[PDB]
């Protein structure tokens, strides 16, 4: 009697759950029956940044001086390597101010938006996002809570592999359908694993 | 901002940039609406030494708005109380006011 189609809605409602579960697991997957993500693997050498002084307090911080130091410290012979970060970090970067009042990037055009693909920064939104909900820039009780992920950088075409065997399938389950409840079944097979985890580094507060 | 230990409300260009770039890009492209006095307020800001933050010496800052997604409508509320309010050392800027919006 529906004035719609549950099925084609649900079929879409499962693939959306697969795509987001796969990508997330491939990042933070924990060992057994989930590919070990490179975050929890914790064999990427991790670089942590210094704290700053303010009115005697030793708040932790993250200055533009760090970002350039981090990106450039990649060994040249490993190859070209992109970077990954939650866009709230990139928003935190573009909005920095020098001593007097000028912006560091994009001096005087209301917005700083360079072509990412030329600065080798692929951007995402389900990374740990250090600036909690864009509310933890930091001068008092807004310090970054030292020990948070900020960005990562790696020669990805050799630092991590993602394997694929079969895309999703949907099969009616005759049996279990008790003449009230039509019951569908879906699944897929895939995996991933970390290759040489020397190509690749992690920044932290 | 603590103007000689007083903490008047304020709104400076650093806030406008951080507000517009925070919009999660997976929602699409978004336009910003605001009262024309606000856009005048941004255009007249000054750095500590006296220069202008926008158009470092032109007598005028007139950028392509449709290339910045700002869509002025002098029909929204403006925090400058028409004019002659907001942007002070002291005795102005109504805490709690409206400034601008942004959405798909």
């Amino acid at each position: 009697e529906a004035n719609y189609d549950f099925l084609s809605f649900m079929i879409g409602a499962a693939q959306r759950s697969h795509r987001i579960n796969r990508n997330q697991a491939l990042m933070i997957g924990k060992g057994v029956n989930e590919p070990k993500g490179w975050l929890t693997e914790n064999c990427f050498p991790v670089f942590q940044t210094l704290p700053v002084d303010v009115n005697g307090t030793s708040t932790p911080a993250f200055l533009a001086q760090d970002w350039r130091r981090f990106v450039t410290s990649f060994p040249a012979e490993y190859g070209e390597a992109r970077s990954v970060m939650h866009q709230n970090v990139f928003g935190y970067l573009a909005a920095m101010v020098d001593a007097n009042g000028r912006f560091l990037f994009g001096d005087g055009d209301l917005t700083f938006t360079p072509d990412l693909v030329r600065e080798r920064i692929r951007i995402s939104n389900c990374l740990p996002d250090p600036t909690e909900g864009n509310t933890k820039g930091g001068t008092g009780q807004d310090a970054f809570a030292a020990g948070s992920f900020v960005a990562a950088q790696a020669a990805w075409k050799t630092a991590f592999y993602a394997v694929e065997k079969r895309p999703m399938f949907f099969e009616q389950y005759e049996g279990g359908s008790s003449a009230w409840c039509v019951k569908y079944q879906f699944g897929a097979e895939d995996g991933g694993f970390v290759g040489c985890c020397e190509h690749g580094r992690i920044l932290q507060i | 901002v603590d103007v000689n230990g007083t903490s008047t409300p304020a709104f400076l260009a650093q806030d406008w940039r951080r507000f517009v770039t925070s919009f999660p890009a997976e929602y699409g492209e978004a336009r910003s609406v605001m009262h024309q006095n606000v856009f005048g307020y941004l255009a007249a800001m000054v750095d500590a030494n006296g220069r202008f933050l926008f158009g470092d010496g032109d007598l005028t800052f007139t950028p392509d708005l449709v290339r910045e997604r700002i869509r002025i409508s002098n029909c929204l509320p403006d925090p400058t109380e028409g004019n002659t309010k907001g942007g002070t050392g002291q005795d102005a800027f109504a805490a709690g006011s409206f400034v601008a919006a942004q959405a798909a």
């Binding site: 210094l50 700053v52 002084d53 911080a61 200055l63 001086q65 935190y92 909005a95 920095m96 101010v97 020098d98 001593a99 909900g133 864009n134 509310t135 933890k136 820039g137 930091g138 001068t139 807004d142 | 650093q14 806030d15 951080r18 507000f19």
Partner: peptide, 20 residues
Amino acid sequence: AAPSRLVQPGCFICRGVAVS
């Protein structure tokens, strides 16, 4: 949604010389 703050970075410059 409750009004969230928008804390942005202050004047951050230095990491090696404290002021007298």
